[PDB]
Design an enzyme around this catalytic site. Sequence first.
Site, PDB file in Angstrom:
ATOM      1  N   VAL A  82       2.728  -0.499 -11.932  1.00  0.00           N
ATOM      2  CA  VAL A  82       1.461  -1.512 -12.225  1.00  0.00           C
ATOM      3  C   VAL A  82       1.990  -2.668 -13.754  1.00  0.00           C
ATOM      4  O   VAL A  82       1.560  -1.386 -14.640  1.00  0.00           O
ATOM      5  CB  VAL A  82       0.206  -0.030 -12.081  1.00  0.00           C
ATOM      6  CG1 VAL A  82      -1.049  -1.616 -12.463  1.00  0.00           C
ATOM      7  CG2 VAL A  82      -0.132  -0.261 -10.909  1.00  0.00           C
ATOM      8  N   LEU A 138       1.883  -0.133 -17.098  1.00  0.00           N
ATOM      9  CA  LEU A 138       0.376   0.940 -17.111  1.00  0.00           C
ATOM     10  C   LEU A 138       0.388   2.314 -16.331  1.00  0.00           C
ATOM     11  O   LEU A 138      -0.357   2.699 -16.037  1.00  0.00           O
ATOM     12  CB  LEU A 138      -1.157   0.043 -16.700  1.00  0.00           C
ATOM     13  CG  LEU A 138      -1.737  -1.170 -17.593  1.00  0.00           C
ATOM     14  CD1 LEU A 138      -1.340  -1.224 -18.988  1.00  0.00           C
ATOM     15  CD2 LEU A 138      -0.447  -2.408 -16.755  1.00  0.00           C
ATOM     16  N   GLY A 139       1.372   2.173 -15.805  1.00  0.00           N
ATOM     17  CA  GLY A 139       1.747   3.139 -15.023  1.00  0.00           C
ATOM     18  C   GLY A 139       2.890   2.850 -13.359  1.00  0.00           C
ATOM     19  O   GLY A 139       3.620   1.754 -13.508  1.00  0.00           O
ATOM     20  N   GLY A 145       3.793   5.075  -9.376  1.00  0.00           N
ATOM     21  CA  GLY A 145       3.485   5.750  -8.671  1.00  0.00           C
ATOM     22  C   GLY A 145       3.519   5.720  -7.492  1.00  0.00           C
ATOM     23  O   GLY A 145       5.063   5.090  -6.705  1.00  0.00           O
ATOM     24  N   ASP A 166      -5.282  11.631  -1.532  1.00  0.00           N
ATOM     25  CA  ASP A 166      -4.975  12.063  -3.419  1.00  0.00           C
ATOM     26  C   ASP A 166      -5.228  11.576  -4.401  1.00  0.00           C
ATOM     27  O   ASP A 166      -4.825  11.000  -5.437  1.00  0.00           O
ATOM     28  CB  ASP A 166      -3.389  10.798  -3.489  1.00  0.00           C
ATOM     29  CG  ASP A 166      -2.613  10.590  -4.580  1.00  0.00           C
ATOM     30  OD1 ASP A 166      -2.298  12.309  -4.927  1.00  0.00           O
ATOM     31  OD2 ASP A 166      -1.754   9.947  -4.797  1.00  0.00           O
TER      32      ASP A 166
HETATM   33  O1  LIG Z   1      -2.266   1.932  -7.809  1.00  0.00           O
HETATM   34  C1  LIG Z   1      -1.975   3.144  -8.864  1.00  0.00           C
HETATM   35  N1  LIG Z   1      -1.291   3.968  -8.477  1.00  0.00           N
HETATM   36  C2  LIG Z   1      -0.982   4.835  -9.655  1.00  0.00           C
HETATM   37  C3  LIG Z   1      -1.618   4.855 -11.017  1.00  0.00           C
HETATM   38  C4  LIG Z   1      -3.140   6.127 -11.305  1.00  0.00           C
HETATM   39  C5  LIG Z   1      -1.939   7.005 -11.924  1.00  0.00           C
HETATM   40  N2  LIG Z   1      -1.075   7.130 -12.645  1.00  0.00           N
HETATM   41  C6  LIG Z   1       0.441   5.481 -12.433  1.00  0.00           C
HETATM   42  C7  LIG Z   1      -0.487   4.021 -12.585  1.00  0.00           C
HETATM   43  C8  LIG Z   1      -2.544   3.270 -11.024  1.00  0.00           C
HETATM   44  N3  LIG Z   1      -3.193   2.749 -12.170  1.00  0.00           N
HETATM   45  C9  LIG Z   1      -3.850   1.319 -12.068  1.00  0.00           C
HETATM   46  C10 LIG Z   1      -4.649   0.615 -12.512  1.00  0.00           C
HETATM   47  C11 LIG Z   1      -5.746  -0.624 -12.385  1.00  0.00           C
HETATM   48  C12 LIG Z   1      -6.050  -0.675 -12.837  1.00  0.00           C
HETATM   49  N4  LIG Z   1      -5.719  -0.590 -14.102  1.00  0.00           N
HETATM   50  C13 LIG Z   1      -5.611  -0.115 -14.781  1.00  0.00           C
HETATM   51  C14 LIG Z   1      -4.830   0.027 -16.091  1.00  0.00           C
HETATM   52  C15 LIG Z   1      -5.096  -0.630 -17.018  1.00  0.00           C
HETATM   53  C16 LIG Z   1      -4.885  -1.076 -17.954  1.00  0.00           C
HETATM   54  C17 LIG Z   1      -4.732   0.298 -18.752  1.00  0.00           C
HETATM   55  C18 LIG Z   1      -4.218   1.235 -18.129  1.00  0.00           C
HETATM   56  C19 LIG Z   1      -4.738   0.937 -16.718  1.00  0.00           C
HETATM   57  O2  LIG Z   1      -3.572   2.053 -19.614  1.00  0.00           O
HETATM   58  C20 LIG Z   1      -3.370   0.959 -19.534  1.00  0.00           C
HETATM   59  O3  LIG Z   1      -4.298   0.057 -20.109  1.00  0.00           O
HETATM   60  N5  LIG Z   1      -4.395   0.795 -13.718  1.00  0.00           N
HETATM   61  C21 LIG Z   1      -3.664   1.747 -10.254  1.00  0.00           C
HETATM   62  C22 LIG Z   1      -3.010   2.108  -9.721  1.00  0.00           C
END
Ligand SMILES: O=C1NCC2(CCNCC2)c2[nH]c(-c3ccnc(-c4ccc5c(c4)OCO5)n3)cc21
Length: 272
Positions: free
Chosen positions: A32, A24-25, A27, A136
């Site tokens: 993640v 999903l990402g 960072g 951040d």
């Molecule tokens: O700790 C985290 N650090 C950075 C990012 C946000 C900025 N882009 C890279 C990932 C991040 N994203 C998440 C996160 C938390 C909960 N759910 C999702 C998530 C779940 C499904 C998804 C999604 C994001 O986007 C595509 O479908 N991401 C946690 C973190």
Amino acid sequence: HVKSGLQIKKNAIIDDYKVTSQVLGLGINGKVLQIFNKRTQEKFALKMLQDCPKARREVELHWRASQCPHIVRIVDVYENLYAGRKCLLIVMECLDGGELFSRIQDAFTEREASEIMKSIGEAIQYLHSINIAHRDVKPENLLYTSKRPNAILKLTDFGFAKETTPYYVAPEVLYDKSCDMWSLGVIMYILLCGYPPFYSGMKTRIRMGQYEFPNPEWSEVSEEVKMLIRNLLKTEPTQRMTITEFMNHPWIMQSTKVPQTPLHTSRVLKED
Ligand SMILES: O=C1NCC2(CCNCC2)c2[nH]c(-c3ccnc(-c4ccc5c(c4)OCO5)n3)cc21
């Protein structure tokens, strides 16, 4: 008035969750990856840190901030041996609603911008009230819960998060916080016009405080909103507005009274 402490499990996450490879990402700490609860069939997301007093701070600061509705909930934290070294697997609620500006990119009004800013503000207000700075707060770390219109915008990633520490005694007799207030100013600036206030050289423009409110993107935007951005994007952090003052500003408190004036933010974002 008394919430539970971090249970922090030791058993393998492969027992409770089927860990996939759909990322999903990336960072600040590690990628993640999406998982699935084996009991039910719910999604959830998995962030993966190696155990070291630092990542163990993140889990602690996130757990306290997790009680806020506009911050990603951590459902469970696991302590496991991956490869052959201690690790902290954080299981969080799924946020498949996309990034803040990814939604906007596909009318959009000033009122909608005001309402969004209140949500981000509520997360920052709770963090500051319990003595936490995010440090951040960026567009990438603000994700919606679902695609449905009405989904809650939540703040994520506590990797840069740090603790900031009579009746007549002064506050200094008892500045990472201000850092977040600048951020809101950037987020709010991009929310109104579709581009950031500084780009490219650029390092100098950020230090000097050299930005503009150009037409056509700010033509319809009020002086009240521009002055609110000015007091968020001050060069001197001690000259900068506090979260309590931000949440008491009429543009944020009464998001409903803010007019439905149309913005260029949707179209401007659309052009990369
Ligand atoms: O700790 C985290 N650090 C950075 C990012 C946000 C900025 N882009 C890279 C990932 C991040 N994203 C998440 C996160 C938390 C909960 N759910 C999702 C998530 C779940 C499904 C998804 C999604 C994001 O986007 C595509 O479908 N991401 C946690 C973190």
